[PDB]
Amino acid sequence: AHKKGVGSSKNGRDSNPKYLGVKKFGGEVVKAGNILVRQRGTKFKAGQGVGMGRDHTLFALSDGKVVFINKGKGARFISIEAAQ
Amino acid sequence: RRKLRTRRKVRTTTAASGRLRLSVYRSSKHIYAQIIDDSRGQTLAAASSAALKSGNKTDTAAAVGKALAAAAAEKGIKQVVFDRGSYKYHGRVKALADAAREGG
Amino acid sequence: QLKTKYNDQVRPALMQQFGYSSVMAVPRIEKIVVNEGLGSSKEDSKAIDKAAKELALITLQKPIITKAKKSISNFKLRQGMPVGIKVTLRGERMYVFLEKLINIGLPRIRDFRGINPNAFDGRGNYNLGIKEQLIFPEITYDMVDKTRGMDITIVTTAKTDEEARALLQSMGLPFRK
Amino acid sequence: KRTKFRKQFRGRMTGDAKGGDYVAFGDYGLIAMEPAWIKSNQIEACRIVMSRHFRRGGKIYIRIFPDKPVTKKPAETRMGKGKGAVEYWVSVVKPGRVMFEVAGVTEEQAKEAFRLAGHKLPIQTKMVKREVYDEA
RNA sequence: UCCCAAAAUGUAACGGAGGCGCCCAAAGGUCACCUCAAGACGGUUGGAAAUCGUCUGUAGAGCGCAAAGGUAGAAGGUGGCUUGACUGCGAGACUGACACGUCGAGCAGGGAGGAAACUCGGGCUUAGUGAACCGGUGGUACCGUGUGGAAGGGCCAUCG
RNA sequence: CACCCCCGUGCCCAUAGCACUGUGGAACCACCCCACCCCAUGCCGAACUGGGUCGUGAAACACAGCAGCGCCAAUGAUACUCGGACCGCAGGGUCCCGGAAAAGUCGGUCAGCGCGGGGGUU
Numbered sequence A: 001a002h003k004k005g006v007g008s009s010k011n012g013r014d015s016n017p018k019y020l021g022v023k024k025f026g027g028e029v030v031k032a033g034n035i036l037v038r039q040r041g042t043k044f045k046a047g048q049g050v051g052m053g054r055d056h057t058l059f060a061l062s063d064g065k066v067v068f069i070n071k072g073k074g075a076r077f078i079s080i081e082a083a084q
Numbered sequence B: 001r002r003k004l005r006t007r008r009k010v011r012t013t014t015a016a017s018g019r020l021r022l023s024v025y026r027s028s029k030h031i032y033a034q035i036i037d038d039s040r041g042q043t044l045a046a047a048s049s050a051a052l053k054s055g056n057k058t059d060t061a062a063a064v065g066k067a068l069a070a071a072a073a074e075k076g077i078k079q080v081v082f083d084r085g086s087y088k089y090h091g092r093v094k095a096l097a098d099a100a101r102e103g104g
Numbered sequence C: 001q002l003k004t005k006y007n008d009q010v011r012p013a014l015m016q017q018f019g020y021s022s023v024m025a026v027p028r029i030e031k032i033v034v035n036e037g038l039g040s041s042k043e044d045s046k047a048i049d050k051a052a053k054e055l056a057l058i059t060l061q062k063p064i065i066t067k068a069k070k071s072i073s074n075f076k077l078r079q080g081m082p083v084g085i086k087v088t089l090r091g092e093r094m095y096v097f098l099e100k101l102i103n104i105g106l107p108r109i110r111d112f113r114g115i116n117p118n119a120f121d122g123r124g125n126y127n128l129g130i131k132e133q134l135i136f137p138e139i140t141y142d143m144v145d146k147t148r149g150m151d152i153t154i155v156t157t158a159k160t161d162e163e164a165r166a167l168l169q170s171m172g173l174p175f176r177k
Numbered sequence D: 001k002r003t004k005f006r007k008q009f010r011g012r013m014t015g016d017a018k019g020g021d022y023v024a025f026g027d028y029g030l031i032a033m034e035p036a037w038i039k040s041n042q043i044e045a046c047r048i049v050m051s052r053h054f055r056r057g058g059k060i061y062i063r064i065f066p067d068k069p070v071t072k073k074p075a076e077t078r079m080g081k082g083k084g085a086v087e088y089w090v091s092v093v094k095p096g097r098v099m100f101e102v103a104g105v106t107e108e109q110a111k112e113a114f115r116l117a118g119h120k121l122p123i124q125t126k127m128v129k130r131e132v133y134d135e136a
Numbered sequence E: 001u002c003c004c005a006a007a008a009u010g011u012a013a014c015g016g017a018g019g020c021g022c023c024c025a026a027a028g029g030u031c032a033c034c035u036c037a038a039g040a041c042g043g044u045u046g047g048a049a050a051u052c053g054u055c056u057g058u059a060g061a062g063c064g065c066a067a068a069g070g071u072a073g074a075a076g077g078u079g080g081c082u083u084g085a086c087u088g089c090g091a092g093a094c095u096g097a098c099a100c101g102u103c104g105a106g107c108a109g110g111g112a113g114g115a116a117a118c119u120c121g122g123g124c125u126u127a128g129u130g131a132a133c134c135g136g137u138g139g140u141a142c143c144g145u146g147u148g149g150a151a152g153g154g155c156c157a158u159c160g
Numbered sequence F: 001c002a003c004c005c006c007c008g009u010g011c012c013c014a015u016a017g018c019a020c021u022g023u024g025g026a027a028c029c030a031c032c033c034c035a036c037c038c039c040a041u042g043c044c045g046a047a048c049u050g051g052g053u054c055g056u057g058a059a060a061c062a063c064a065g066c067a068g069c070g071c072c073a074a075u076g077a078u079a080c081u082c083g084g085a086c087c088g089c090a091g092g093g094u095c096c097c098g099g100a101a102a103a104g105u106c107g108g109u110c111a112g113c114g115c116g117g118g119g120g121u122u
């Protein structure tokens, strides 16, 4: 036993596995359920036939074609323009 | 404030529901109770109060709602979405609802 | 109980003093705010009811306790603890407490001469300062706990301090000469 | 010299001068022709050289500041971690960057104080004059 | 979690920084309502800040924590009513050598909020964890050594 | 979408915004008016909410002017760079070929486009 410290200060190991990003892109065919975006907050917000999971995951509600709408950052949307 | 209109107007999930929206202008005494189409930038039915108020101004309640409900069948409309602008759904606007909720 | 005495004497006089295009463009009194910024050095559960009950007899209104902004500064500062007592007066209840001031409040003050006239709230408003509690019509040392005071704010529809200054005095208000 | 508040450590990379005019503040300047890391002590060395030459007044503009922290080898090893916080502070200088500029002194007075300050620097320099009014 | 990381994903070092091993019965569900930090000028204990008032104010605040993303048409702040922090299931994807891990529309039984469209299978998200083996406990009545029971086991649940 | 204007509601969400300045009242909208209840304020009809005029168009709004500020923003040139090929012991640099900024300057803007209902051309 010493009077100094428990864990030694000034470290540099530590980091984490992690994934993320866009899964399906502008002009891709999607089946219903297909995840099209993995993200943190609401980088991209849901549109036509596009849902939003607990972890802001954007998925297809109904089959079709992925369409991206870029209004100017923040106002970003993914939609499904149903093929039929 | 102006945040209340945009609030209910945002919670009115347009195309997911399939239904048409029913707007109301009860801030003044010339209630505009309109049937507005989601997709097309169109207003279908509608019933005002300026064109003969029937003496009443706030009591014209059911009158504008009845006028609307009847005008809806004339077009076919049966499925609706009511949008209480900033109006706390209680008097003037609560009657217009039942007036249309019983007139079709 | 004062309404027409605001109109008939003050209202036409301001168009006969200045000259407004309409009866609506003439300055008006928006609201009267009464604030009791106690606590800090008076952190007691007993003192909470004290001024609040005393305020309920003068304004005829139940007062609200404006809690601290959760400011946990160096000195005696913490979470949302009771630090101020507020009551708003507008319309009917406003003129009941305003008349009570010019008649019993303002003259029946020990060491009285008049109130500060100098440029107050630059955008046509007034913020009165009271330095005692035993100078009110319904407040006496017989049925109390200790010795204190209060603060009062007068909100007006006046565009400038120039137009605000006239309205206050012509309603009946002391100015040190 | 050193900076007041920071992060502790840095890196390294280079390419032609980004933010260095010609005639701002002073009448005559001293421009870098080579890239380097200007040590706090080399600037101090140049300053004192110029200040001494221009005895009284004080019209020396040091347009460069040492902000980059550099590290060191305690004595041996490698069987340990990242090192030496407190070695020395540096200013990343790229060719074109005005390091110093003088005022209220003649062409001849300035020619010399810069000729002197040049001998204390780890790079080749050039003495300059006016005719640069880019954006103000 | 950020940086390294070379504008997809991924990527090492005894490289540079910093957190987690829980918490919340509301800090959950839903329906209502509210809108921040700061500064100037004016005022009771006061007076550097405080409680009040007007004027500026994408947000310079907040979000139980670390940081990043996100966010005021709220994810911030306040209240009513509540227990979906449900049981049986999973079209289809994300992610990993596996074993794990993530997201999820839709169907049934039953509910909660709301007039209603609707929303609800915990929390703005990304940490708050531990295979298997042996075993404690509530349920179940599958096996049970000739038969009928029983001991013991199996099976749901869950604790170490 | 004969034409003017107004009240609602869209697409578009700064070339749509702010400031300054001017016009509009009894059509529409705004304050206003009173409130014991329906309903509402951790206090106050401020806001919600109810009954209604008058009075005014002050405030708000709508519309119009304007280029002071915001916002938008070239051409040229450079930075940087895919591929080809080199220089320097090095930090670092060059040539050929396409690609191509950011900032700045010229300048451009006080939007454009729908649907419904109300009131005017005495």
Ligand SMILES: [Mg+2]
Residues within 6 Å of the ligand: none
């Ligand atoms: Mg620009």
Ligand SMILES: [Mg+2]
Residues within 6 Å of the ligand: F083, F097, F098
């Ligand atoms: Mg090529």
Ligand SMILES: [Mg+2]
Residues within 6 Å of the ligand: none
């Ligand atoms: Mg190359």
Ligand SMILES: [Mg+2]
Residues within 6 Å of the ligand: none
């Ligand atoms: Mg070589």
Ligand SMILES: [Mg+2]
Residues within 6 Å of the ligand: none
């Ligand atoms: Mg080229």
